[PDB]
């Protein structure tokens, strides 16, 4: 099961980005879709399922790509994107 079931909703995750500092650079919509919510501190985000945290986002970073790069064992990532996608990033 998810590490943090309470952030399993994409809409709740999107709502968490109300004070996101990088709107143009790394869209909240893409982050939320990729399982991430904003912790509220700097640009630190975390996946509701694997609880993997990421920060220091660069402009044009792709949330799904970063998810697979750093947390390839995440089952939310697997269910959403499939194994071929994860394999191709690694």
Ligand X SMILES: CN[C@@H](C)C(=O)N[C@H](C(=O)N1CC[C@H]2CC[C@H](NC(=O)c3cccc4ccccc34)[C@H]21)C(C)(C)C
Q: Residues in the site for Zn ion, rule: CB under 5 A?
A: 47, 49-50, 71, 74
Q: Which residue number, 24 or 90, has a Cβ lying nearer to Zn ion?
A: 90
Per partner kind, with CB cut-offs from 5 to 8 A, the member of ligand X, Zn ion, none near residue 74 is Zn ion
Exposure pattern of 25-55 as b/e (b: 16+ CB <10 Å)? ebebeebbebbbbbeeeebebbbbbbebebe
Q: Which does 55 bind (CB under 5 to 8 A by kind): Zn ion, ligand X, none?
A: ligand X
CB 62 within 8 A of CB 30: yes
Cβ 42 to Zn ion, closest distance in Å?
Answer: 19
């Amino acid at each position: 099961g998810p590490a943090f079931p309470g952030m399993g909703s994409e809409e709740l995750r999107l709502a968490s980005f109300y004070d996101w500092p990088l709107t143009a650079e790394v869209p909240p919509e893409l982050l939320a879709a990729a399982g991430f919510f904003h912790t509220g501190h700097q640009d630190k985000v975390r996946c509701f399922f694997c609880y993997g945290g990421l920060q220091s986002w660069k402009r044009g970073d792709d949330p799904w790509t970063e998810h697979a790069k750093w947390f390839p064992g995440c089952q939310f990532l697997l269910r959403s994107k499939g194994q071929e996608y994860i394999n191709n990033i690694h």
